[PDB]
Amino acid sequence: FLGDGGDVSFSTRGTQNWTVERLLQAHRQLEERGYVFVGYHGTFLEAAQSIVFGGVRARSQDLDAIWRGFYIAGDPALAYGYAQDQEPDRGRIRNGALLRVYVPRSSLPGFYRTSLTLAAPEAAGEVERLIGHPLPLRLDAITGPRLETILGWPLAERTVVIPSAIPTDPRNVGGDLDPSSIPDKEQAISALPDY
Amino acid sequence: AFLGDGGDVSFSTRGTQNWTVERLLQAHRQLEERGYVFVGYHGTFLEAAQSIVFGGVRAAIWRGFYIAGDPALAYGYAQDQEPDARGRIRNGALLRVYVPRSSLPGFYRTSLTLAAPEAAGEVERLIGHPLPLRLDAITGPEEEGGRLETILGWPLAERTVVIPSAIPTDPRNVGGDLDPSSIPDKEQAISALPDYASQPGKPPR
Amino acid sequence: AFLGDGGDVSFSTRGTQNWTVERLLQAHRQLEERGYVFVGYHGTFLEAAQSIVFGGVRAAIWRGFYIAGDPALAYGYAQDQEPDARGRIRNGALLRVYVPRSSLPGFYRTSLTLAAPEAAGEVERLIGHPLPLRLDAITGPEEEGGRLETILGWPLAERTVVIPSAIPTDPRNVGGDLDPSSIPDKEQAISALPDYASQPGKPPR
Amino acid sequence: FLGDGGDVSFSTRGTQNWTVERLLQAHRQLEERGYVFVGYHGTFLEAAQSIVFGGVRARSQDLDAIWRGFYIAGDPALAYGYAQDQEPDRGRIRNGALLRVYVPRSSLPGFYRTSLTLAAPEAAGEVERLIGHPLPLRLDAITGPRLETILGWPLAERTVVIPSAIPTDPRNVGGDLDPSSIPDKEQAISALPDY
Ligand SMILES: NC(=O)c1csc([C@@H]2O[C@H](COP(=O)(O)CP(=O)(O)OC[C@H]3O[C@@H](n4cnc5c(N)ncnc54)[C@H](O)[C@@H]3O)[C@@H](O)[C@H]2O)n1
Ligand SMILES: NC(=O)c1csc([C@@H]2O[C@H](COP(=O)(O)CP(=O)(O)OC[C@H]3O[C@@H](n4cnc5c(N)ncnc54)[C@H](O)[C@@H]3O)[C@@H](O)[C@H]2O)n1
Ligand SMILES: Nc1ncnc2c1ncn2[C@@H]1O[C@H](COP(=O)(O)O)[C@@H](O)[C@H]1O
Ligand SMILES: Nc1ncnc2c1ncn2[C@@H]1O[C@H](COP(=O)(O)O)[C@@H](O)[C@H]1O
Ligand SMILES: C[C@H]1O[C@@H](c2nc(C(N)=O)cs2)[C@H](O)[C@@H]1O
Ligand SMILES: C[C@H]1O[C@@H](c2nc(C(N)=O)cs2)[C@H](O)[C@@H]1O
C-alpha cells in the first residue's frame, strides 16, 4: 500500500523514504479500490511499524471492555498529542509517528456522531442507541467530543494504514503541532466524511 | 461479532453447532447493513474452518485465497485432503465469504485458465499493475473441469468477513458430490453473485 | 399446459402479462413432478419469446441452442439486437428452460472456449461421437468475458419445456445490466443448477 | 436417431435400409441418453415418414377434445391393426408402417393405468382423478383396455420415434400379425415398464 520507492521506516529523524509525492500515489491507489481516509492515529515508533507492516490488531485482553476500539482523530493536532509513553528511554521520551487511517467507503453508514463525551458512563446508553446493539462497537465507529473517533475493533482490523507526511518534532514532543508543518498537498487529501 | 445471536458456533463432523438457516439470515442482513457483499464459498477441513471463522483469513505470482461462487466446486475441498494427525479423513465445512461492496471494482473476470501462457499479462492488464493481486480478485475457469474459481489477492482476503454456511457436508459420503437438494432454499435465495468486470478498470468517478 | 393457472400470458415491454412469482412456483413444481429439471435462462426479443413459449424451441459443427445458467449473461441478449420492423430497439424477456432429469448424463463441461482450436476434439471426446451435438449439451466459458454458456444440441433443445421468468427487463434502461436485486428471491431459490460431467460418459448402468 | 447406414425410407416393399442390426445400435444410443421404449405406433407410409423425419406434431384443430393424444400399444399385434386409411389408392389399400416410440425415463411417473375403457364417458372422471387435473392429458399418458396407451400431446411431441424391424405384409394388410415375423433380437428390446 506504500507505493513505489525504497523500504519505508520510522525514526526520530523521520519516516525514512516517505515523500508527499509517494503519499499522493498511495492515496490514489486506495481511492481506486474504494477506501476512504477517516482520520489520523498518533503513536510511538515501533507501534507505527507494527500497524503499517503487521496490521491493526486488537489485544486478546479486556474483551468485554465497553469502550474498546482503535482511536483516531480527524484533526492531526489532536492525534499529534500522541507519541512515546515509555518515559524511561533515563527519564527520556521520543517523538512518535502520525499515521493515516482508511476504511471502505461502504462502511460509512456505520459511522455515528454524538455530542456526548466518549468513554464516559452517560454516553453509553446514547451510543448503544445510535449503533443498534449493546456496546462494544463491532463494525461501527463513533464520533464525539475537540472531536475524536473510535473504530470498533472488527472495523479497525480491516482498515488500510499508511504513513502521514506531517512530521514529528523532537524539540516539541507531543502537543502544539506546528500548522506550518502540515504539507498542503496532504491537507487537500485530508477531508473527513459526514456522519 | 458477525455470527448473530444464539450461542457459540463450533465445527464438527455432525455439522456446525449452533448454526441454523435462520441464524444465517440474520448475520447476512446485519452484514449487508454494514455494507458487505457475499462473493463466494470456501470449502475446508474442520480445523481450518474454526480458525478462519474465529481468527480470520490470513496469509509466487498467483498467490491468494481461493473461493467459488458455485457451492458445488467449494464442496469438493470441504474434507481432509490427506489423513489428519489421528489418521482420519473426514468431512469439513463450507464457509461464506464477504467483502465490502466498495471493493467490487477490483474484481475482474477472464475466459482464460490461470495456467494458460497468456494469463499473467491478461490479468495484469485488467488489474492495472504487476502481479501478485493486491486489493483485486480474478474469477475464471478452473484448469480442468470448466467451473469458475475466484482468487482474492491477500491484502483483500484478510479484510473479508467469513461466516459459516448452512449447506451441510455428509459424513456418510466423504468426498461425495454436493446433492443440490441439501442446499436450503433460504440460503440459495441469498447467494446471487455480483457481476464482475471483464474490462480493465476505468479511472474512478 | 406448462404455465399453470391464471389466464393467458403475453410478452410486452412493460413486462410479461399474467405471470407472477407465485404462478412461476406452481408451474415449476408441476414440471418437477413430471420429471423436468431447470438448466438455464434464455434471453431474447419480445417476438421470439412468445414464439418459443407458445410454439416451442425449433431449429455447422457448433449448431445448437444457447442458454446461460447465470441470469446476468442471458440478460444482455434480452432486447432487440438491431432495430425491429418499426425502427425500435426495445427490452425483451428472459425464459426458463427445462429438460428431462434423465437427459442430464448428456450434459458435459469444459474449461475451453468453443472457439479454441482443440475444442472440437475435446467436445467429441466427452460426447462420444462426432459433432454436431445431438441429445447432448456442453457448458463452457464464453469466448470473451469468462461467464459460462451452454449449447444444447438441436435434438435436445426441441424437447425442452420453456416457461417465462419472473426476472423483469427494464424499459428505462435498454441494454443495461441486470440489477441482481431485481431477481425475486423466490426465483433465485429455485434456480440451482445440476452438476454437469467433466469426464466422458461411462456406459450406462 | 437412425444410426449409421444409408438413407432410411418407407415402401410397401419395406422400410428401405433398416436392419435389426441398425435397430440395435439406435436403441442403445437412446438408452444411453435416458430414453425408454413405451410401445408401437402403426400408421400409413407417409405418416411414418412425417413422424420419423419431421416429428410427432399435433393438429391445431380440436384443441379441447377430451381424449386427444397420440395412440400407441405395447403389443405390436394391436398396433399392426393400423395402416392405410386412404381406401381409394380404385378401392385399394396399402400396407403401412410400424414404429417404435420412446420417452425419457423420467416421465414414467406420469404414466397411469386404468381398467376402464379409454375414450368412453365413464372412464373420464377416473382418469382425471389418476392424472391430477382435468382432461386432456398434458405431460401424462394413460393405459387401459387388449391394452392401448394414449400420450398427452405435450408428451407425444417430445418423444423420439424410430422404425420397427417387424415388417408389414401386403398379402395380409392390417390384422393378424404373423408372430414368426417379429425378430427376436427386437423382441428382447420391447419390454414395457409398469404403471
Ligand atoms: N477450497 C476452496 O474453496 C477452493 C475453491 S477453488 C479451489 C482450488 O484450490 C486450488 C489451490 O489449493 P491450495 O491447497 O494450493 C490453496 P492453499 O495452499 O492456500 O490452502 C491453504 C489451506 O489452509 C486453510 N487455512 C487454515 N486456516 C486458514 C486461515 N486462517 N486463513 C486462510 N487459510 C487457512 C485454507 O482454507 C486451505 O484449506 C486452486 O487452484 C483452486 O483450483 N479451492
Ligand atoms: N441469448 C441467450 O440466452 C444467450 C446466452 S449465451 C448467448 C450467446 O449467443 C451467441 C450466438 O448467438 P446467435 O445469434 O448466433 C444464436 P441464433 O442465431 O441461433 O439465434 C436465434 C434467435 O432467434 C430466436 N428464436 C425465435 N423463435 C425461436 C424458436 N421458436 N426457437 C428457437 N429460437 C428462436 C432465438 O431465441 C434467438 O434470439 C452464442 O455464441 C453465445 O455466446 N446467447
Ligand atoms: N498492531 C497494533 N494495532 C493496534 N494498535 C497498536 C498496535 N501496535 C501498537 N499499537 C498501539 O497500542 C495502543 C492501542 O491498543 P489498546 O491499549 O488495546 O487500545 C495504541 O498506542 C496503538 O497505537
Ligand atoms: N406428424 C405426425 N404426428 C403425429 N401423427 C401423425 C403425424 N403425421 C401423420 N400422423 C398420423 O395421424 C393420426 C394421428 O393424428 P389425430 O387424427 O390428430 O390423432 C395417426 O394416424 C398418425 O399416425
Ligand atoms: C488508547 C488511548 O488513545 C487515545 C487516543 N489516541 C489517539 C491517537 N493515539 O492518535 C487519538 S485519541 C484514547 O483517548 C485512549 O486514551
Ligand atoms: C387415432 C386413432 O388411432 C387408434 C390407435 N392407433 C394405434 C396405432 N395407430 O398404432 C394404436 S390405438 C385410436 O383408437 C384412434 O382411433
Beta strands in B45-142 (DSSP E): 65-67, 93-100, 107-109, 137-141
Question: What distance in Å separates the CA atoms of residue A22 and residue A126, rounded to the nearest whole number?
Answer: 41
Is D31 an active-site residue?
no
Nearest partner of B73 among C198, C96, C104, C113, judged by Cα: C198
Q: Which residue from C110, C148, C185 is facing B148, i.e. has the nearest CB?
A: C148
* Residue A74 is labelled as binding a ligand: no
Chain C residue with CA closest to D154: the answer is C1
CA angle B87, B93, B99 (to 5 degrees): 135
Ligand 6 atom closest to Cα of D150? Answer: 12
SS3 at position A16: strand
Q: Which residues contact B147 (CB under 8 A, 6 or more apart)?
A: B68, B70, B72, B73, B141, C109
**Residue C128 vs residues C103, C105, C121, C122, D175: alpha-carbon distances, Å:** 15, 12, 10, 10, 42
Interchain pair C204, D31: CB under 8 A = yes
Breaks (C-N over 2.5 A) in chain D follow: 89, 145
Which chains does D contact via 3+ CB–CB distances below 8 A? C
- Paired with B138 in beta bridges are B108, B151
CB of residue A79 inside a 6 A radius of ligand 5: yes
D190 and D75 in contact (C-beta within 8 Å)?
Answer: no
Tell me phi and psi for residue C23, to 5 degrees.
Answer: -75, -20
Helix (H) or strand (E) holding D123: helix D123-131
Helices (H), A81-181: 123-131, 153-156
Listed residue (D85, D78, D46) closest to D192, CA to CA: D78
The radius of gyration of chain C from alpha carbons, rounded to an integer in Å, stands at 17
Q: What does DSSP assign to residue A134?
A: S
- Partner-chain contact A32 B155, CB within 8 Å: no
* Interior angle at CA B82, CA B77 and CA B83, nearest 5: 125
Place of cell 519516516: A15
User: Which of B95, B96, B101, B97 has the alpha carbon at shortest distance from B34?
Assistant: B101
- CA–centroid distance, A41 to ligand 5, in Å, is 8
DSSP code string of B9-46: -B--TT--BT--HHHHHHHHHHHHHTTEEEEEEEEE-H
Helix (H, G, I), strand (E, B), or coil: what is residue B50?
Answer: helix
Annotated binding site of C for NAD(+): 42-44, 51, 56-59, 149
Test B36 with A140 for CB contact under 8 angstroms: no
Cα dihedral A43→A44→A50→A51 (10° resolution): 10
Query: Among residues C166, C96, C98, C3, which one has the least CA distance to residue D138?
Result: C3
Q: What is the largest CA-CA distance in chain D?
A: 49
Distance CA D113, CA D184 (A): 27
CA–CA separation, D21 vs B13, rounded Å? 53
Query: Which grid coordinates belong to B147?
Result: 467451473
Interacting residues of D151 by C-beta distance below 8 A, sequence separation 6+: D38, D69, D70, D71, D72, D101, D103, D137, D141, D159
Q: Which residues of A form the catalytic set? A: 148
Strands D141-144, D111-113: pairing is parallel
In contact, C80 and C51? CB cutoff 8 Å: no
**Whole-angstrom distance, CA of residue D40 vs CA of residue D71:** 9
Q: HEC states along chain C?
A: CCCCCCCCCECCCCCCECCCHHHHHHHHHHHHHCCEEEEEEEEECHHHHHHHHCCCCCCCCCCCEEEECCHHHHHCCCECCCCCCCCCCCECEEEEEEEEHHHHHHEEECCCCCCCCCHHHHHHHHHCCCCCCCCCEEEEECCCCCCEEEEECHHHHCCCEEEECCCCCCCCCCCCCCCHHHCCHHHHCCCCCCCCECCCCCCCC
Exposure class string for A13-39: b at 16+ Cβ within 10 A, else e: eebeebeeebbbebbebbbebbbbbbb
B204 chain-A contacts, CB cut-off 8 A: 31-32
| A163/A51 Cα distance (integer angstroms) | 10
B182 touches chain C (CB under 8 A): no
Tell me the technique behind this structure.
X-ray
Q: Which residues contact B68 (CB under 8 A, 6 or more apart)?
A: B40, B41, B42, B43, B74, B147, B148, B149, B150
For residue C49, give the C-alpha cell.
419469446
CA–CA separation, D126 vs D135, rounded Å? Answer: 10
Would you call D110 and C34 a contact, using CB atoms and an 8 Å cutoff? yes
Cβ(A94)–Cβ(A44) below 8 Å: yes
Tell me the C-alpha distance between A91 and C61, whole Å: 85
Bridge partners of C161? C98
Side-chain half-sphere exposure of C117, counting CA atoms within 13 A: 0
What's the rounded Cα separation, in Å, for the pair C63 and C136? 12
Closest C-alpha to ligand 3, atom 5: A56
The SS3 of residue D141 is: strand
State how far Cα C4 lies from the chain centre.
20
Q: Report chain breaks in chain B, C–N > 2.5 Å, as residues after which they occur.
A: 59
CA distances A77 to A117, A183, B114, D94, D97, Å, are 19, 13, 49, 106, 98
**Atom nearest to A78 CA in ligand 5:** 11
Q: CA of C150: which chain B residue's CA is closest?
A: B146
Q: In this structure, are strands B137-141 and B107-109 parallel, antiparallel, or unpaired?
A: parallel
Q: What does DSSP assign to residue A103? A: E
* D67 and chain C in contact, CB less than 8 A: no
Q: Do D43 and D83 contact (CB within 8 A), yes or no?
A: yes
Decide if A110 contacts A139 (C-beta within 8 A).
yes
Q: How far apart are CA B70 and CA B72, in angstroms?
A: 5
Q: Which amino acids of B are annotated as binding site, given as ranges?
A: 42-44, 51, 56-59, 149
Please state the separation of Cα C78 from the chain's center in Å: 11
Atom of ligand 5 nearest to the CA of A119: 14
C-alpha to C-alpha distances, A84 to A80, A167, C89, C191, D70, nearest whole angstrom: 11, 15, 68, 59, 91
Choose which residue among A61, A67, A71 to substitute to test ligand 5 binding: the one with the highest number of ligand atoms within 8 A of its C-beta. Answer: A71
Q: Rounded to the nearest 5 degrees, what angle is found at the Cα of A156, between the Cα atoms of A151 and A161? A: 120
Q: How far is CA D53 from the centre of its chain?
A: 15
Pocket-testing residue among D44, D70, D80, D82, ligand 6, by greatest number of atoms within 8 A of Cβ:
D82
D107 by DSSP, 3-state: which? helix
Cβ(A104)–Cβ(A120) under 8 Å? no
Closest by Cβ to D106, choosing from C56, C102, C106: C102
Is B41:B165 a contact under the CB 8 Å cutoff?
A: yes
List the beta bridge partners of residue D103: D36
Q: And the C-alpha cell for D178?
A: 404373423
CB-based burial of residue C14 (10 Å sphere; 0-12 exposed, 13-18 middle, 19+ buried)? exposed
- CA A84, CA A174: separation in Å to the nearest integer? 9
Contact B130, B63 (CB under 8 A): no
Under 8 Å between Cβ of C168 and C15:
yes
- What domains appear along chain C, each with residue ranges and CATH number? 1-205 (3.90.175.10)
Q: Hey, how many other C-beta atoms are within 10 angstroms of the C-beta on D189? A: 18
